[PDB]
Amino acid sequence: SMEQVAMELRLTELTRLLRSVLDQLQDKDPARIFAQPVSLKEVPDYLDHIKHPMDFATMRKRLEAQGYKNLHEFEEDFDLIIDNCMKYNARDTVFYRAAVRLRDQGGVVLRQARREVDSIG
């Protein structure tokens, strides 16, 4: 139908805007701490600690499959990256500190993305 097509064009454009958001967030992680899944070869007990692992490569796969229906779903995944790290790692680690900086800097990007998604519909 024409409506399914129009809905599909909306999802495509949301995907384009979320791709730009993802790029901006990932630039706030210049050390690439959050770029890939935590390795289960190198942290074999990780899933005993963290029940829903997340990372930027995994978000990018979901994004390119148009698997984010709205900004809320995309933010959920970004928040997992941060919140998993802040639980698994102690306060005095480069990992935790990187997550806090990513959260603080990403807030700005996500604040305007919410306005853009609301604005363009």
Swiss-Prot record:
There is a cross-link at residue 41 (Glycyl lysine isopeptide (Lys-Gly) (interchain with G-Cter in SUMO2)). It is found in: Nucleus; Chromosome. Coiled coil: none annotated. It comes from the Eukaryota. Highly expressed in testis. Residues 9-113 form the Bromo domain. Scaffold subunit of various histone acetyltransferase (HAT) complexes, such as the MOZ/MORF and HBO1 complexes, that acts as a regulator of hematopoiesis. Plays a key role in HBO1 complex by directing KAT7/HBO1 specificity towards histone H3 'Lys-14' acetylation (H3K14ac), thereby promoting erythroid differentiation. Component of some HBO1 complex composed of KAT7/HBO1, MEAF6, ING4 and BRD1/BRPF2. Component of the MOZ/MORF complex composed at least of ING5, KAT6A, KAT6B, MEAF6 and one of BRPF1, BRD1/BRPF2 and BRPF3. Interacts (via PHD-type zinc finger domain) with unmodified histone H3. Interacts (via PWWP domain) with dimethylated and trimethylated 'Lys-79' on histone H3. This is Bromodomain-containing protein 1. The lineage of its organism: Eukaryota, Metazoa, Chordata, Craniata, Vertebrata. The gene is BRD1.
